[PDB]
RNA sequence: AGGUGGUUAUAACGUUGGGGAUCCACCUCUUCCCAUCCGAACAGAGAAGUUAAGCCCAACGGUGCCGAUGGUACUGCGUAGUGGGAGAGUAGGACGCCGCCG
RNA sequence: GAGUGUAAUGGCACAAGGGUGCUUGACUGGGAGACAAACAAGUCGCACAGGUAGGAAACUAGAGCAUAGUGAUCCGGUGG
RNA sequence: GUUAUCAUGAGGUAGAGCGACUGAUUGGAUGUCCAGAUAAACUCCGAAUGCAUGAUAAUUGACCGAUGGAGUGAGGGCAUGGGUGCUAAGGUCCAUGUCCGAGAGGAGAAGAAUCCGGACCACCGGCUAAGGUCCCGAAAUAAUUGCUAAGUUGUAAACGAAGUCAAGAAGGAUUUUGGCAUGGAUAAUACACGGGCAUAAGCAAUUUACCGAAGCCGUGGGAU
């Protein structure tokens, strides 16, 4: 009578942080992800852990394209 | 696998970083068996700003210089410098290099 | 006894049967069948007893179909074992069914024999059932 | 081969409208095909009782009140999971312009020789056929007077009329 | 078998690791000498 | 262009969201009447607590 | 009959025919730039030859792709009512639509 | 439907998968702004100055497809 | 700060599906094909709700910073989504609400959390909620239409016989879906509609009036 289980690790709080429509300052973290679930578009950079962050200030836009690939970009002025 | 699937594969690798704006327009070259062409393109607009070719104008490498120079004069009048040179799936060699060298030697920072 | 040849996992969480069956509520193979009116786990021992009963009738002329397969593992702790300390000893497999799901299909026999043969099989089952005849059937040709 | 059906107009749609319709022992129904939009209407359980619960097939001559008159065939019947009662029907409009696939009963009309012993077995009870609606038989007769031993007549090895056997050729339509 | 390494030649030092059973020769890499403000060769000690 | 709303059921054992909707309407006591302009924002508040209020 | 973009294939794939004014292509040879075991690829040097193939045009619902209306499942609130409403399948659509340059 | 040294999951075709040529950015001085969050800790990322590598150039490089491979303070050792 | 509306955004649950993958799987013709079908650790698909941002509206003001003082860190019931257990437990472990805790009043005969309802004080005033109106016990032996014959009722099943009422189907017989009853129905100090007792004073339906709380209103008097 025993269990060989009982283990788990801490969750990483991953996901979208700034949604489409909101305003971002340069440097703001937009998406925490494993791999490129979302892809960097215009004015958006990618970190070592595939973190998506804003290179310029503006409006966050999501956009689906060929093969339902999602891109994240910043719309400036 | 058919002389074009590889070229399109190389084309998209070059286009992953090279594009054109109103400033620094893209310099694009197409090499046929007999001729050679060039084009200045504004990707945001989508329209061509200038062009040159040897259809209506020495070995083939000796004729790419004239194309590489005639594209400079066309851009010199329109007020273009510091273009960006894309390979278009072409190895930087031979005729294509002479076209790039002539464009750089003129008024463009190709 | 009807059970998977192999499984990917040894244990399974006890799920939840929610509504009426939306698949397997229509006869496809035979002309007569029995359909459940309750949601319940059906064991392999229950199915074997019912199938032997219906096959014993109709002599040796006709074909019987089992339209459910028990693929859900279940466990049981046993006597003198307190709550906790993990899952219990394995106890075979069951098939969960919802109201409307057809269990036994019969073909090759006249109307009256089929009605009686599936009545004996339904009396070995833990759920109340209902006789169904296919709507394209002809009473004047059997 | 022909059935007479009529139906009342249907206006409201949705969960509330349909549930109230069947409270009067009615069935929601639609008709569509070829040119023109569909028609929403209401039939009754008594009216369609002999159209569906039957070993026969018919070319429905449908007269929807308030809209017009058409010709149609049964396409889809929706049954309740537990009560086995009809809850929805859609009729496909048929015209004399292009064929339409439908399945007609096939009848094994004496048996070949002494036969292998009470076999005379009808396996494939229905066969898909595409043709003009006025060329589809009420039945698919077969004469069986050869190979009393172990034999089978396939779907491909048969030619009836200006029909088209789409019923999954290289299959088996009778045996023994 | 992966140990610390200290490349040398105030003085300029760089700390790094290497497998002492795979790379058996002393490490010699060109690095930026802050004191001289130019690249020089740093060898393992 | 106005509309009068009366509370007729208690707010005991109601979800916090419904309790907060009555506050946004101004209702804090049984049988109390409030008056408002019948705009789409106010109408969505009444529709959320329709089982608790009356239009009078 | 070319180059280069936009639109998430209704755009793709495929099938059967047509095309050589000029273009694109296959094509001929490796002394040179450059390359692999091999000028097959990549590169250079030519126009002696062909439309056979890629390529473009017409027609085709063939494989994929898009897809209703109605009905149903599910569900928020609420204790039968009041709102939201799939997936699958069926009628159908579709052999692209737009810019710039030569 | 393979691979990605190593569990699982997510990702990867312009490949992040496989080859070669040259190389040491597995840089010195750095942290606008964010994620995460009892605290202690953790995570992603500048601008530009100095000097490099690859490249025709544009450009990329402050280690590795990502997420585990760990241990405070006190007390001692070594180099400036 | 909150709630509603509008705009914008990212989802992979419920459901569904399986020639869209992996695993599992039924019957046929014969790896090929035709049907049938499954999953917490399957997904070609995919809601309702919820979540984030902005604007407008309403909102007794409900939010935040600094700084003085705390207590708490044994919870519990119910509903919904689940794991575990035996689809046991007034069981156990989470999530979302709610109430008891720290909450009196009314109904339920008598019950911490079921139904109604949040008690400033007084009153020999009035209107209502849940639930009721033959008597104990406040208010209809009220009106109208059916059902039940079992005192069922007024506060369990597989399986029999179909006792009776309504609406049909096929063609006196069979049968289908509803409604109410009947057998199955079962231990130990004496038993239960709470009791009397009722053939309606039971059940279903519609209608009016009335009764009913510390709820609301009225009158007087205080407080923050
Ligand atoms: K009671
Ligand atoms: K009163
Ligand atoms: Mg985790
Ligand atoms: Mg719909
Ligand atoms: Mg900072
Ligand atoms: Mg499910
Ligand atoms: Mg399923
Ligand atoms: Mg403690
Ligand atoms: Mg505790
Ligand atoms: Mg408990
Ligand atoms: Mg539980
Ligand atoms: Mg306890
Ligand atoms: Mg309380
Ligand atoms: Mg009295
Ligand atoms: Mg006793
Ligand atoms: Mg009061
Ligand atoms: Na745990
Ligand atoms: Na609902
Ligand atoms: Na759909
Ligand atoms: Na499957």
UniProtKB/Swiss-Prot annotation, chain A:
Membrane-traversing stretches: none
Protein's recorded name: Large ribosomal subunit protein bL27
Alphabetical list of Pfam families matching this protein: Ribosomal_L27
Name of the gene this protein is made from: rpmA
PROSITE patterns tied to this protein: RIBOSOMAL_L27
Family per similarity comment: Belongs to the bacterial ribosomal protein bL27 family.
GO molecular function: structural constituent of ribosome
A GO cellular component annotation in the UniProt record: cytosolic large ribosomal subunit
Curated annotation (Swiss-Prot), chain B:
Family: Belongs to the universal ribosomal protein uL18 family.
Protein name: Large ribosomal subunit protein uL18
Function recorded in the entry: This is one of the proteins that bind and probably mediate the attachment of the 5S RNA into the large ribosomal subunit, where it forms part of the central protuberance.
GO cellular component, one term: cytosolic large ribosomal subunit
Domain of life: Bacteria
A GO biological process held by the record: translation
Quaternary structure and interacting proteins, as annotated: Part of the 50S ribosomal subunit; part of the 5S rRNA/L5/L18/L25 subcomplex. Contacts the 5S and 23S rRNAs.
Record has Coiled coil as a keyword: no
GO molecular function term, any single one: 5S rRNA binding
Alphabetical list of InterPro entries matching this protein: Ribosomal_uL18_bac-type (IPR004389), Ribosomal_uL18_bac/euk (IPR005484)
Keywords: Ribonucleoprotein, Ribosomal protein, RNA-binding, rRNA-binding
Entry annotated with the keyword Ribosomal protein: yes
From Swiss-Prot, chain C:
CDD domains cross-referenced by the UniProt entry: Ribosomal_L16_L10e
Gene Ontology MF term list: rRNA binding; structural constituent of ribosome; tRNA binding
GO cellular component: cytosolic large ribosomal subunit
Superkingdom classification of source: Bacteria
InterPro entries found in the cross-reference section: Ribosomal_uL16 (IPR047873), Ribosomal_uL16_bact-type (IPR000114), Ribosomal_uL16_CS (IPR020798), Ribosomal_uL16_dom (IPR016180), Ribosomal_uL16_sf (IPR036920)
One Pfam short name: Ribosomal_L16
Keywords tagged on the record: Ribonucleoprotein, Ribosomal protein, RNA-binding, rRNA-binding, tRNA-binding
GO BP of this protein: translation
PANTHER family: 50S/60S RIBOSOMAL PROTEIN L16, LARGE RIBOSOMAL SUBUNIT PROTEIN UL16M
Family: Belongs to the universal ribosomal protein uL16 family.
Oligomer and partners: Part of the 50S ribosomal subunit.
Annotated function: Binds 23S rRNA and is also seen to make contacts with the A and possibly P site tRNAs.
This protein's name: Large ribosomal subunit protein uL16
Organism: Porphyromonas gingivalis (strain ATCC 33277 / DSM 20709 / CIP 103683 / JCM 12257 / NCTC 11834 / 2561)
Swiss-Prot record, chain E:
GO CC annotations on file: cytoplasm; ribonucleoprotein complex; ribosome
Record-level Gene Ontology MF annotations: structural constituent of ribosome
Coiled coil: none
Keywords tagged on the record: Ribonucleoprotein, Ribosomal protein
Superkingdom, taxonomy of origin: Bacteria
GO biological process, alphabetically ordered: translation
Residue ranges of the TM segments: none
Entry's family note: Belongs to the bacterial ribosomal protein bL33 family.
Protein known as: Large ribosomal subunit protein bL33
Species for this entry: Porphyromonas gingivalis (strain ATCC 33277 / DSM 20709 / CIP 103683 / JCM 12257 / NCTC 11834 / 2561)
């Amino acid at each position: 009578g025993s269990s060989k289980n009982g283990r788990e690790s801490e969750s990483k709080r991953l996901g979208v942080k700034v949604y489409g429509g909101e305003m971002a300052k340069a440097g703001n973290i937009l998406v925490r992800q494993r791999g490129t679930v979302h892809h960097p578009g215009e004015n958006v950079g990618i970190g070592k852990d595939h973190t998506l962050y804003a290179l310029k200030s503006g409006v966050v836009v999501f956009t689906r394209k060929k093969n339902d690939r999602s891109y994240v970009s910043i719309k400036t002025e | 696998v058919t002389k074009e699937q590889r070229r399109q594969k190389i084309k998209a690798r070059v286009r992953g970083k090279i594009s054109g704006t109103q400033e620094k327009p893209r310099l694009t070259v197409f090499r046929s068996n007999k001729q050679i062409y060039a084009q200045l393109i504004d990707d945001i607009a989508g329209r061509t700003l200038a062009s040159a070719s040897s259809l209506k104008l020495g070995s083939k490498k000796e004729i790419a210089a004239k194309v590489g120079d005639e594209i400079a004069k066309a851009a010199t009048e329109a007020g273009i410098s510091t273009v960006v040179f894309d390979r278009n799936g072409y190895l930087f060699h031979g005729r294509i290099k002479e076209l790039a060298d002539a464009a750089r030697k003129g008024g463009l920072k190709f | 006894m009807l059970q998977p040849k192999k499984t990917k996992f040894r244990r399974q969480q006890k799920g939840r049967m929610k509504g009426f069956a939306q698949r397997g509520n229509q006869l496809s193979f035979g002309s007569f069948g029995i359909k459940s009116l309750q949601s319940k786990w059906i064991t392999g021992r229950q199915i074997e007893a019912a199938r032997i009963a219906v096959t014993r009738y109709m002599q040796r002329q006709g074909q019987v179909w089992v339209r459910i397969f028990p693929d859900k593992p279940i466990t049981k702790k046993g006597e003198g074992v307190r709550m906790g300390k993990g899952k219990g000893a394995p106890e075979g497999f069951v098939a969960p069914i919802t109201p409307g799901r057809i269990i036994f299909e019969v073909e090759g026999v006249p109307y009256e024999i089929a009605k009686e043969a599936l009545r004996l099989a339904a009396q070995k089952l833990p759920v109340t059932t209902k006789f169904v005849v296919r709507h394209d059937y002809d009473i004047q040709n059997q | 081969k022909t059935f007479q059906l009529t139906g009342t107009p249907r206006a409201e749609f949705g969960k509330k409208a349909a549930k109230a319709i069947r409270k009067e022992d009615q069935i929601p129904a639609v008709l569509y095909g070829g040119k023109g939009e569909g028609v929403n209407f209401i039939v009754s359980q008594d009216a369609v009782r002999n159209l569906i619960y039957s070993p026969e097939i018919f070319l429905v001559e449908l007269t929807v009140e308030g809209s017009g008159s058409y010709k149609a065939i049964l396409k889809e019947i929706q049954f309740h999971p537990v009560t086995d009662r009809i809850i929805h029907i859609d009729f496909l409009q048929v015209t004399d312009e292009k064929p339409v696939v439908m399945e007609v009963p096939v009848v094994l009309t004496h048996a070949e020789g002494v036969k292998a012993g009470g076999k005379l077995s009808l396996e494939m009870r229905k066969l898909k056929v595409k043709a003009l609606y006025s060329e589809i038989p009420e039945k698919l007769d077969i004469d069986v007077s050869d190979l009393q031993l172990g034999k089978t007549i396939q779907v491909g090895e048969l030619h009836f009329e200006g029909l088209t056997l789409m019923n999954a050729k290289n299959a088996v339509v009778c045996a023994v | 078998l992966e140990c610390t390494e200290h490349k040398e030649s105030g003085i300029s030092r760089y700390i790094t690791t290497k497998n002492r059973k795979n790379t058996t020769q002393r490490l010699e890499l060109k690095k930026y000498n802050p004191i001289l403000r130019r690249m020089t060769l740093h060898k393992e000690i | 262009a106005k509309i009068k709303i009366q509370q007729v059921r208690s707010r005991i054992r109601c979800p916090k969201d419904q309790k907060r909707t009555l506050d946004a309407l101004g209702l804090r006591k049984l049988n109390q009447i409030v008056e408002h302009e019948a705009t789409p924002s106010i109408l969505g508040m009444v529709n959320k607590v329709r089982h608790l209020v009356l239009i009078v």
